């Protein structure tokens, strides 16, 4: 019996009153539009935006901590080299804005050097992410922004085949170019590759030796959240799968890194975390389409002037529910992303990694996406600040959260009545 039930639960009586009143239903649908704009249309004030920015930054910061310590080398097939030095620019190396892959003889592989094949995948993803972060990530709803990315690497040493026409795609090793396209995010991304040889004895050449320089210019690279998350996934998965050998220089006093020496997939807790953050951010961004698909701005009411009937006139409700649920799911995942990395709830060696390295910057803060000779061994990806802004944004989403829940409950009531 229902009277006896609405005794025990006063709020359900109120919920039923609201559900049969178009003025209240329409008010809930307005709220849903406003909270959607908050989530997918804002940046600073959106928990969703902050949780995405945070996942991306954790991946980037992971490599700014460990890149410099990581071995790489060999030749183009992933095989050992006799005498190859391949230097990637705008990478966070020991006291340097480049990372040098010059480990010979050892077979590239697990607990070995990272292959140049893997380092190129890693590097491309990193250059794209640092360029996007530097420009600013758009709001989640903006899926057609692009960005332009440029990066260089050099090859030297006898037998080094990492910059040769065969690998590079270029016809002429000295002054040749190649344009190739590729279809990512349903979007055409143009790449321009150009090669150039500087001789051992040639005007302004510090490195006493002969080398080849490769330039990659990428236009039309999608900067949407889904796309940039796919880039961070490639970064952290390339590292985890290649699982190369690293060894570190711990500074005097500072913070202490454990272990010194080892392999990169050995940071299991940290990698799992970053992967989970990315996975939750991708799911969270996925809710954008559900929201878009179920717009809530058509006002609702009875048929033919006669009063609203919650049992027959409520076919909008499935869409209202789906929307409200999607919004709620964005908020919870956003929260979940933050709790995965927030050091308040971390323990042991994993907490020490986050508070002493990941959430740290050694740069003389400098803007996002900036690599300096002091970037190594520090995240330089605004991790403390992003955790803080996520929390701030959630705290300023108090009202909206309650409105989403109320909208979810109204719709749910109506879906029920309509069976």
């Amino acid at each position, epitope marked *: 019996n229902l009277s006896k039930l609405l005794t025990r639960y006063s709020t359900l009586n*109120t919920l039923i009153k609201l559900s049969a009143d178009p003025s209240a239903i329409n008010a809930a649908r307005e709220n849903l539009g406003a909270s959607a704009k908050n989530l997918i249309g804002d940046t600073k004030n959106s928990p969703a935006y902050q949780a995405v920015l945070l996942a991306i930054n954790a991946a980037v910061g992971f490599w700014n901590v460990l890149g410099y310590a990581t071995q790489c080398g060999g030749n183009a097939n992933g095989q050992e080299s006799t005498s190859s030095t391949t230097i990637f620019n705008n990478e966070p190396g020991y006291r340097s804005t480049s990372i040098t892959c010059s480990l010979n003889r050892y077979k590239p592989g697990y607990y070995g050097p990272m292959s140049i094949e893997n380092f190129k995948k890693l590097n491309e993803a990193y250059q794209i992410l640092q360029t996007a972060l530097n420009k600013g990530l758009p709001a989640l709803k903006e899926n057609n922004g692009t960005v332009s990315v440029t990066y260089t690497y050099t090859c030297s040493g006898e037998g080094n085949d990492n910059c040769l026409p065969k690998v590079t795609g270029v016809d002429n090793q000295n002054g040749g170019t190649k344009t190739k396209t590729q279809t990512i995010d349903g979007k055409t991304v143009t790449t321009t590759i150009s090669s150039k040889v500087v001789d051992s004895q040639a005007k302004g050449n510090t490195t006493r030796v002969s080398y080849t320089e490769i330039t990659n210019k990428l236009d039309g690279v999608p900067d949407s959240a889904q796309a940039l998350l796919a880039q961070a996934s490639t970064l952290i998965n390339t590292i985890n799968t290649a699982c190369p050998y690293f060894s570190v220089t711990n500074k005097s006093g500072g913070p202490q890194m454990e272990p010194t020496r080892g392999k990169l997939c050995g940071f299991t807790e940290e990698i799992s975390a970053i992967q989970k953050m990315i996975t939750d951010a991708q799911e969270l961004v996925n809710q954008t389409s559900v929201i878009n698909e179920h717009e809530q701005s058509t006002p609702v009411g009875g048929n033919n002037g006669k009063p609203f009937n919650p049992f027959t006139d409520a076919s909008f409700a499935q869409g209202m529910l789906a929307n409200a649920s999607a919004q709620a799911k964005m908020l919870n995942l956003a*929260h979940q992303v933050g709790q995965t990395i927030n050091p308040d709830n971390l323990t042991g060696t994993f907490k020490n990694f986050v508070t002493g390295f990941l959430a740290t910057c050694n740069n003389k803060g400098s803007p996002p996406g900036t690599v300096t000779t002091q970037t190594f061994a520090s995240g330089c990806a605004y991790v403390e600040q992003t955790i803080t802004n996520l929390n701030n944004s959630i705290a300023h989403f*108090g009202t909206q959260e309650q409105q989403i829940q109320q909208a979810e409950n109204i719709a749910d009531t109506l879906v029920n009545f309509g069976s």
Partner: nanobody
Amino acid sequence: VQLQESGGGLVQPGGSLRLSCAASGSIFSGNVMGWYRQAPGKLREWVAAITPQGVPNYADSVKGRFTISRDNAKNMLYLQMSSLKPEDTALYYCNRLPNYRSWGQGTQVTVSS
């Protein structure tokens, strides 16, 4: 996974009350926490929030009159209410933000006469 509010009562308009909330660590630690209230004939309304680092924010209905605070050593949340009006009459609840799906019993505040 525990929320236990206390401190409420019947008071005069003009009055003041201090509400307390014992939260478990699982809920409380590293989390934005807040106060809610559910008045007669209405659904639950958000009132105030506070980040782990201590930054508070308030609903327009209570800004200027209520202070929310947190004690991170003992997972306690507090709401100091001042200049109470009859309109503040409700059941008050703490939760984290975004909300844990099980609410505590709340504590009744009645402002009257």
